[PDB]
Design a protein around this ligand. Structure first.
Ligand code: HEM
Length: 336
């Protein structure tokens, strides 16, 4: 059926026309997605350890906490180094790709030791700053070896963007989520293809204006395309959106999905958390429905959720206003 069109890498194109508070603009993006699910219990678990202990470091007060945490990551690293990631199952253990994979953890352990030295000395601040640089390695290596890669570069084609890039992330292809083999009957998104689906949202920015978006996601030839119109009203000119007070980063979220039998579709809600420069957080409340375009039948799911992670970055050679996006996403909430 429609999931078959996602079994390999798929080229993507994104076009957005926006008007916020009268500020018109256009964003155009291209890239690819890779929705196939493959998983390793061992890596999953090593990666959980790594992930949790980084957060412990970020919030820690004293060196004792940071040392303890860094030591635990180091074990996970060396253990993760012996695994075979799902993306490289078919590769020889001594292949160039598997060597690079292992080399990724040689860098990572190197960086951890750097952070250990600073921690042992009592330099908690400096250690936390050295712990941050691990993220760069994670991002580089996730982009080569982690499953479900969605990758896209977006350019503001009308010049300077009058809203922060982070606020447009959600709007700018949930058909590229990884549904685990047992949850494949709950994947509305892929099921609707190639005729595709209409995706509508209202996004309420706490104590500021709202965005209201309408989009068509469908295959145009071999490309999965996402085309959106977006109106923003009621934004405050010294607010976080129009005042450009949002940090250039993105958090991880749960996206809650349920069937909407009335509309042969799905209703969807979540709350995006946008970090602000001063240290505060600004909530973006998402209300969403999806409706098929075609008359063909479509999988209506049970309650479940998508778990998301995103890295935002820049192309050092790009002079236009832009955003590079790396994103991994997995359906969850239903066992065997
Ligand atoms: C501090 C650094 C890192 C963190 C915080 C981190 C975190 C994570 C997280 C949270 C996941 C998702 C696990 C899940 O889906 O349950 C993951 C997956 C993965 N990571 Fe990392 N990671 C880091 C570094 C690396 C490095 C250096 C590599 C490669 C050398 C790597 C390779 C992978 C792979 C292949 C997956 C997919 C696991 C699977 O699907 O079985 N990671 N990581």
């Amino acid at each position: 059926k429609g999931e078959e069109l996602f079994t390999g890498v798929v080229p993507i194109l994104v076009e957005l026309d926006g008007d916020v508070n009268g500020h018109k603009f256009s964003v155009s993006g291209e890239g690819e997605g890779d929705a196939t699910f493959g998983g390793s219990a061992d890596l999953e678990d090593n990666m959980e350890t790594l992930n949790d202990n980084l957060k412990v470091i970020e919030k820690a007060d004293n060196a004792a906490q940071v040392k303890d945490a860094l030591t635990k990551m180091r074990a996970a690293a060396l253990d993760a180094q012996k695994a075979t990631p799902p993306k490289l199952e078919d590769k020889s253990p001594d292949s160039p790709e598997m060597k690079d994979f292992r080399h990724g953890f040689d860098i990572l352990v190197g960086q951890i030791d750097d952070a250990l030295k600073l921690a042992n000395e009592g330099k908690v601040k400096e250690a936390q700053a050295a712990a941050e640089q691990l993220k760069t390695t994670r991002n580089a290596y996730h982009q080569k070896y982690r499953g479900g890669k969605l990758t896209l570069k977006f350019i503001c084609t009308t010049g300077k963007l009058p809203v922060p890039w982070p606020t447009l992330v959600t709007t700018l292809v949930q058909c590229f989520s990884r549904y685990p083999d047992h949850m494949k009957q709950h994947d509305f998104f892929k099921s609707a293809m190639p005729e595709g689906y209409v995706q509508e949202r209202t996004i309420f920015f706490k104590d500021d204006g709202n965005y209201k978006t309408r989009a068509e996601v469908k295959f145009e030839g071999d490309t999965l395309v996402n085309r959106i119109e977006l109106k923003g009203i009621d934004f405050k000119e010294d607010g976080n959106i129009l005042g450009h007070k949002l940090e250039y980063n993105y958090n991880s979220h749960n996206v809650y999905i349920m069937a909407d039998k009335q509309k042969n579709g799905i209703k969807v809600n979540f709350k995006i958390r946008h970090n602000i420069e001063d240290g505060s957080v600004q909530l973006a409340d998402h209300y969403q429905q999806n409706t098929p375009i075609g008359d063909g039948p479509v999988l209506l799911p049970d309650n479940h959720y998508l778990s998301t992670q995103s890295a935002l970055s820049k192309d050092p050679n790009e002079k236009r206003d832009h955003m590079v996006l790396l994103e991994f996403v997995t359906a969850a909430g239903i066992t065997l």
